[PDB]
């Protein structure tokens, strides 16, 4: 129903959040050394 | 100073991605309610 | 309905947290640009 | 350079916040599937 469209979209956004964290970690590595 | 430049660009792109996440979660709320 | 509301409130709370993260990252960005 | 060190600390704090958000959204996903 609407709930499972919601679950698909929330899972996609969780994946996007993981990507954001990874990219911020690489920017930290560039800022340090 | 080039690494600081690259950090500024990358952090801005990630801010844009966070805004995208927030907006998609908002219409996920619309799909959950009705 | 009750549980739907519980999911809705929790996701809204996480949206507010994400907006806060965006604001703080923008402030660190402004500090990086003036340096 | 102290501003760079402070930027590193603060961005790490926000990365931790983002991971916590991901965990809470996974918990809401588990509740939505039931």
Swiss-Prot record, chain A:
Glycans are attached at residues 4, 25. Changing residue 7 to F: In strain: Gamma/P.1, Theta/P.3, Zeta/P.2. Residues 1-33 are annotated as: Heptad repeat 2. Residues 7-33 form a coiled coil. Subunit of the fusion protein that is processed upon entry into the host cell. Mediates fusion of the virion and cellular membranes by functioning as a class I viral fusion protein. Contains a viral fusion peptide that is unmasked after S2 cleavage. This cleavage can occur at the cell membrane by host TMPRSS2 or during endocytosis by host CSTL. In either case, this triggers an extensive and irreversible conformational change that leads to fusion of the viral envelope with the cellular cytoplasmic membrane, releasing viral genomic RNA into the host cell cytoplasm. This is Spike protein S2'. It comes from Severe acute respiratory syndrome coronavirus 2 (2019-nCoV). The gene is S. The chain holds residues 1170 to 1202 of 1273 of the full protein.
UniProtKB/Swiss-Prot annotation, chains B, D:
Residues 1-34 are annotated as: Heptad repeat 2. It comes from the Viruses. Residues 8-34 form a coiled coil. Glycans are attached at residues 5, 26. Subunit of the fusion protein that is processed upon entry into the host cell. Mediates fusion of the virion and cellular membranes by functioning as a class I viral fusion protein. Contains a viral fusion peptide that is unmasked after S2 cleavage. This cleavage can occur at the cell membrane by host TMPRSS2 or during endocytosis by host CSTL. In either case, this triggers an extensive and irreversible conformational change that leads to fusion of the viral envelope with the cellular cytoplasmic membrane, releasing viral genomic RNA into the host cell cytoplasm. This is Spike protein S2'. The chain holds residues 1169 to 1202 of 1273 of the full protein.
